[PDB]
Amino acid sequence: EEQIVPFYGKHQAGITTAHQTYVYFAALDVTAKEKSDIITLFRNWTSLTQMLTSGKKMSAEQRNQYLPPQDTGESADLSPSNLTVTFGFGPSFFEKDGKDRFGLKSKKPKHLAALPAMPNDNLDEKQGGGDICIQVCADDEQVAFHALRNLLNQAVGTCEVRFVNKGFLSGGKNGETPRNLFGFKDGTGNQSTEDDSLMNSIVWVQSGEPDWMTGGTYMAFRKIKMFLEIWDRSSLKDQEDTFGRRKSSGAPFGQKKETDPVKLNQIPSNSHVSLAKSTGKQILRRAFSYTEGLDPKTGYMDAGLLFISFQKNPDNQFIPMLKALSAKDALNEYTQTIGSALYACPGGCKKGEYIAQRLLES
Amino acid sequence: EQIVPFYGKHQAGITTAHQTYVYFAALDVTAKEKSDIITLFRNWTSLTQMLTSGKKMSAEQRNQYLPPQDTGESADLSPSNLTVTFGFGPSFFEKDGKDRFGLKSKKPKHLAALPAMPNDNLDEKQGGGDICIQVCADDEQVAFHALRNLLNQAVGTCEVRFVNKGFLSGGKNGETPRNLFGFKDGTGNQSTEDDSLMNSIVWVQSGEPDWMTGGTYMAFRKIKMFLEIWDRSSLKDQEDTFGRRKSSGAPFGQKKETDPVKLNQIPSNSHVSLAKSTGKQILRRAFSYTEGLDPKTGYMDAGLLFISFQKNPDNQFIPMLKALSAKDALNEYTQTIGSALYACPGGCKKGEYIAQRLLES
Numbered sequence: 132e133e134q135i136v137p138f139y140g141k142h143q144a145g146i147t148t149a150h151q152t153y154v155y156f157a158a159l160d161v162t163a164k165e166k167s168d169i170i171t172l173f174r175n176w177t178s179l180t181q182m183l184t185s186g187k188k189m190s191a192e193q194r195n196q197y198l199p200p201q202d203t204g205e206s207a208d209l210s211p212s213n214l215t216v217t218f219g220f221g222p223s224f225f226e227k228d229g230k231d232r233f234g235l236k237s238k239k240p241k242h243l244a245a246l247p248a249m250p251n252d253n254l255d256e257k258q259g260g261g262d263i264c265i266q267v268c269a270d271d272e273q274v275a276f277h278a279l280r281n282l283l284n285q286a287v288g289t290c291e292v293r294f295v296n297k298g299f300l301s302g303g304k305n306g307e308t309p310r311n312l313f314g315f316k317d318g319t320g321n322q323s324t325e326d327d328s329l330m331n332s333i334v335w336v337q338s339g340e341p342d343w344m345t346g347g348t349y350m351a352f353r354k355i356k357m358f359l360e361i362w363d364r365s366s367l368k369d370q371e372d373t374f375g376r377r378k379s380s381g382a383p384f385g386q387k388k389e390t391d392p393v394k395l396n397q398i399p400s401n402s403h404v405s406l407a408k409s410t411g412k413q414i415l416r417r418a419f420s421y422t423e424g425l426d427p428k429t430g431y432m433d434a435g436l437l438f439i440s441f442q443k444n445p446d447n448q449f450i451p452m453l454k455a456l457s458a459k460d461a462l463n464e465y466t467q468t469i470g471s472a473l474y475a476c477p478g479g480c481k482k483g484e485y486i487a488q489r490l491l492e493s
Numbered sequence: 494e495q496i497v498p499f500y501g502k503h504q505a506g507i508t509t510a511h512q513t514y515v516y517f518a519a520l521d522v523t524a525k526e527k528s529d530i531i532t533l534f535r536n537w538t539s540l541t542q543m544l545t546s547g548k549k550m551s552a553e554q555r556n557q558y559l560p561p562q563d564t565g566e567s568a569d570l571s572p573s574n575l576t577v578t579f580g581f582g583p584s585f586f587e588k589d590g591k592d593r594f595g596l597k598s599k600k601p602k603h604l605a606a607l608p609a610m611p612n613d614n615l616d617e618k619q620g621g622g623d624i625c626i627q628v629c630a631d632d633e634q635v636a637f638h639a640l641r642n643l644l645n646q647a648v649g650t651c652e653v654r655f656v657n658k659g660f661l662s663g664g665k666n667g668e669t670p671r672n673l674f675g676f677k678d679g680t681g682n683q684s685t686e687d688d689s690l691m692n693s694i695v696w697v698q699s700g701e702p703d704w705m706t707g708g709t710y711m712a713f714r715k716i717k718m719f720l721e722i723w724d725r726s727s728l729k730d731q732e733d734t735f736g737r738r739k740s741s742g743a744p745f746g747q748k749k750e751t752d753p754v755k756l757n758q759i760p761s762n763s764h765v766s767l768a769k770s771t772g773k774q775i776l777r778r779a780f781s782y783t784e785g786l787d788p789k790t791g792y793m794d795a796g797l798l799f800i801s802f803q804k805n806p807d808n809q810f811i812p813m814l815k816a817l818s819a820k821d822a823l824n825e826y827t828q829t830i831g832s833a834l835y836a837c838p839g840g841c842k843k844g845e846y847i848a849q850r851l852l853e854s
């Protein structure tokens with residue numbers, strides 16, 4: 132065994148866990164009618180995820196060769212590649228069209244609502260929302276896709292799949308901050324995910340939420356198109372100015388080191404770093420780049436960021452950033468948000484329990 | 494050092510060990526003069542050399558008012574066995590009966606659109622193209638970085654026709670990589686380290702324009718794979734479709750993946766049976782793709798970027814295509830939605846540029 136990340140724990144993996152290279156990110160709508168159908172679904176997803184992340188090798192026997200294989204096979208020879216699978220629920224899981232579909236509204240999390248419309252949104256409704264999100268990460272795309280596929284396979288009959296995105300973010304060979312598609316290092320401003328205390332104040336829900344959220348968090352999702360062709364033709368100055376860091380070093384303007392503190396009065400008031408840091412709030416950003424062939428509409432490379440961030444309180448920590456950035460981020464010149472969602476992520480699973488058990492009345 | 498020589502007798506990325514990631518693009522030349530194309534090929538040479546060598550694109554950082562020459566996302570990354578391969582389609586040589594660039598006298602012997610086959614549902618905008626670029630690396634970000642910087646240099650000269658990307662992970666202990674059907678992919682290929690076998694299967698050695706010497710032809714097919722129909726099929730149906738066992742990858746009746754196929758032991762209509770029975774060899778070097786939900790099926794949109802190399806597509810590849818399109822069991826679970834044939838020049842010598850002998854220095 133080698134690249135394994137415990138599935139069971141105080142929290143779900145794939146949040147504070149070291150950033151893997153690949154993500155597959157899916158949203159589902161529950162079409163089933165009874166909570167018991169959903170319990171079944173969550174039960175099976177638990178077994179299978181445990182199996183997948185542990186590197187438990189599925190086969191060996193597979194009796195009755197007239198039956199479908201229970202596993203799709205393409206990961207048979209592959210390392211678990213730090214596979215994590217994270218689950219969350221959107222507003223619509225709890226209340227859809229003013230109806231409480233599953234008797235769950237009394238256990239609705241404190242901060243779970245659609246994100247407010249923002250300026251420069253060009254949201255595709257079908258590229259956001261959804262009853263359930265599944266975030267699958269691994270250091271190997273094939274491993275990640277294998278997981279999503281086997282998980283989605285189990286949801287046939289109960290859910291319809293709403294969207295499946297995938298992305299990548301390679302870190303440096305020597306552990307440097309991974310660079311996004313704008314050539315800039317991404318994640319410098321995050322607090323240390325290995326600092327349990329900082330993660331408890333930023334990410335982890337500890338109280339003031341339904342019990343099933345304890346050791347959970349909220350996940351904000353934004354699919355943000357990045358106009359590479361316009362960016363690439365911009366001067367280095369314009370690029371650096373857009374962010375308030377230098378491209379190479381990743382250092383804040385005026386500072387020498389990437390990890391030096393940002394000096395606010397040294398970067399434009401309209402820079403991405405400036406706007407986000409002001410407001411004074413912290414989130415845990417854990418984004419991945421995407422490319423999706425040619426945009427049929429522009430004829431250019433369809434590319435962007437799968438912005439994913441975790442926060443114990445999206446209203447206090449994330450939305451104010453979103454408000455500030457959408458107003459006058461210099462970055463707005465080179466990006467546009469085309470998908471949006473907010474998910475509530477349950478606390479971790481204890482061995483012998485299933486995901487979100489405490490939410491569907493065990 | 495995860496570097497693969499760019500310069501050599503052949504272009505890299507053909508017999509070179511299969512990397513995990515590919516970006517596969519086609520371009521149309523919109524420029525009018527050969528000299529524009531020479532410039533394009535000259536620049537692509539410098540940049541490819543630079544990129545594949547792991548030369549870290551630096552030296553200075555001045556004139557902050559200019560766009561940076563390099564996009565930067567690969568700054569911290571190993572070259573990850575980056576290879577970049579170039580080829581040309583029929584349309585490079587002749588468009589509308591006219592010879593666009595004075596190149597028809599050096600047209601390769603076998604370069605034509607593949608014939609339409611039964612079951613084809615070709616999207617014309619998912620195939621053809623004047624120039625293909627195949628970018629492979631063990632790291633998607635490195636591969637995308639290369640394509641992007643290469644395409645960036647083509648602005649003004651070409652328009653991009655399509656960009657595909659795919660993956661195919663080999664086992665932790667070097668097993669044959671499995672495609673999205675869970676089956677090992679490439680067992681039947683001869684050894685790419687057997688120079689003689691590669692000379693008879695892949696490499697052009699004579700009877701072609703001189704710029705093709707140590708070149709090859711690249712057949713491309715974008716083949717959708719219906720994962721949801723496959724997944725619901727019995728193991729028997731799956732194994733029967735191919736004529737090998739899923740796990741071992743061994744031919745029916747044999748114990749080992751590399752044991753010889755015994756034809757009278759696998760269905761008449763199995764993929765392996767029909768392909769082998771043509772008596773012909775190709776070099777398959779495919780990658781899986783996923784592209785989100787198909788808006789039409791509502792399922793995963795997934796398949797194979799089938800890429801194969803052969804010295805003579807008319808003798809080696811087309812007869813396979815004929816046989817398989819007729820009655821391959823696999824036709825139940827796949828459908829070809831893009832097609833192209835490209836002629837790949839011989840390798841570049843240091844101080845020369847790609848396809849120079851065709852464009853005449």
Ligand code: HEM
Pocket residue numbers: 311312313315316317318319320321353355374376393403404407408412414416436438452453456462466
């Ligand atoms: C929901 C939208 C986004 C939010 C809420 C957001 C938020 C943030 C935050 C909080 C920081 C750290 C600032 C600090 O406290 O020091 C940051 C930095 C940064 N963001 Fe974003 N961001 C968003 C979208 C994007 C996009 C589309 C890009 C494009 C690549 C991007 C690139 C960067 C870069 C390069 C930095 C450098 C600072 C760092 O990561 O340490 N962000 N962003």
Ligand code: HEM
Pocket residue numbers: 672674676677678679680681682714716718735737754764765768769775777797799813814817827
């Ligand atoms: C129509 C395009 C294709 C052609 C021309 C083609 C050709 C071939 C050839 C020549 C072989 C070697 C057989 C032998 O001599 O032992 C082979 C084997 C195989 N093909 Fe294909 N193939 C095609 C499409 C596909 C697709 C879409 C898949 C998967 C979806 C696939 C999966 C396989 C597998 C699993 C094997 C056996 C393992 C191996 O020896 O490579 N093929 N194919």
Ligand SMILES: [Cl-]
Pocket residue numbers: 280283720721792793
């Ligand atoms: Cl699917």
